[PDB]
């Protein structure tokens, strides 16, 4: 209920303060790199869960709804994170400060290079749009609340509208005209469909890896089984 009372500046501040840290990872091989990425994803998940609880309006939901939203959106949230960190590194994915991979190192894992390309293209798009940090944290919160809303429901849409108001607020503050605000809003939100697409492909890829060994954490396995 308090989330609806937040001003546009309160929303940005709350989301910026709730931002998770940038974690680190541990001659690479297939099982090696997959080990590093899945280990990284597992530790990031723990930070994401406590981040979600700090997203305004999320704690108002039942535990069931909270679980459902995170189960649906977790890989999307990890991916938009990666893409965001990789903005200032053209042709490179910044999984970790010590783990900066180009597209060729994605060929070390079978079928992953296609997903790498989609991530790089997304990062390039963010760079072309000159995506701001304030816009990013809004988009990430939107993903969390939207990706599983169609699979109480009015409260979610209330909060979603607030974040839309917050995005427009940031654009109006940036000096954009009314027509530019609407266009930029559209551009940003359409990227979420590509992010949805990448997550679906990644979930299919990650499920392919599980069936065929390299290890994954129990939490990661549960988040994976939720899409099957």
């Amino acid at each position: 209920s308090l989330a609806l009372s937040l001003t546009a500046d309160q929303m940005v501040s709350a989301l910026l303060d709730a931002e998770p840290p940038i974690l680190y990872s541990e001659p690479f091989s297939e099982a090696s790199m997959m080990g590093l990425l899945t280990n990284l994803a597992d530790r990031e998940l723990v930070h994401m869960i406590n981040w979600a609880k700090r997203v305004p309006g999320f704690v108002d939901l039942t535990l069931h709804d909270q679980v459902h939203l995170l189960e649906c959106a977790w890989l999307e949230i990890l991916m938009i994170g990666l893409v965001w960190r990789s903005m200032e590194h053209p042709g490179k994915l910044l999984f970790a400060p010590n783990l900066l991979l180009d597209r060729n190192q994605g060929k070390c894992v079978e079928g992953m290079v296609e997903i790498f390309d989609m991530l790089l293209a997304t990062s390039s798009r963010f760079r072309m749009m000159n995506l701001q940090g304030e816009e990013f944290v809004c988009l990430k919160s939107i993903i969390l609340l939207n990706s599983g809303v169609y699979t109480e429901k009015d409260h979610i849409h209330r909060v979603l509208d607030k974040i839309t108001d917050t995005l427009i607020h940031l654009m109006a503050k940036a000096g954009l005209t009314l027509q530019q605000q609407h266009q930029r809003l559209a551009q940003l939100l359409l990227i979420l469909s590509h992010i949805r697409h990448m997550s679906n492909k990644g979930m299919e890829h990650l499920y392919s890896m599980k069936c065929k060994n390299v290890p994954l954490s129990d939490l990661l396995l549960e988040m994976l089984d939720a899409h099957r």
Partner: peptide, 9 residues
């Protein structure tokens, strides 16, 4: 479920 317990904390 592990996710269930981490949220409840």
């Amino acid at each position: 479920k592990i996710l269930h317990r981490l949220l409840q904390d």
